[PDB]
Amino acid sequence: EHVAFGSEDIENTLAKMDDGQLDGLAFGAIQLDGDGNILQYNAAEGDITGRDPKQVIGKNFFKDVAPCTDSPEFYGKFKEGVASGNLNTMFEYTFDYQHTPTKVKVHMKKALSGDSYWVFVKRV
């Protein structure tokens, strides 16, 4: 899939993509509901993080999968965006829960329709 991390219209290009199409991206992509439950999780993300994309679907990202992100700098920004119904933030972060510390660039952006939210990830 020919889409660049950080592109202005990423939410339109990815909108309603099925699981298989999302696996074609060059960067990690997760779709969350407004409570943080994982709706989609692509192959590129699993390669970065070690998680098995099939097993994490349905888990809560902040409470279960990614406690290192349960902080004002990541979860706090997410929940503020869900509450306001708009989110578009890019920042670096280190993943270090039961894995070798890995620094990444994160882009969180509200999905175009409904009340869903993207978390995009690439290595830095």
Ligand SMILES: *C(=O)/C=C/c1ccc(O)cc1
């Ligand atoms: C910290 O606990 C981070 C964990 C994590 C980040 C991203 C993922 O896709 C999975 C787990």
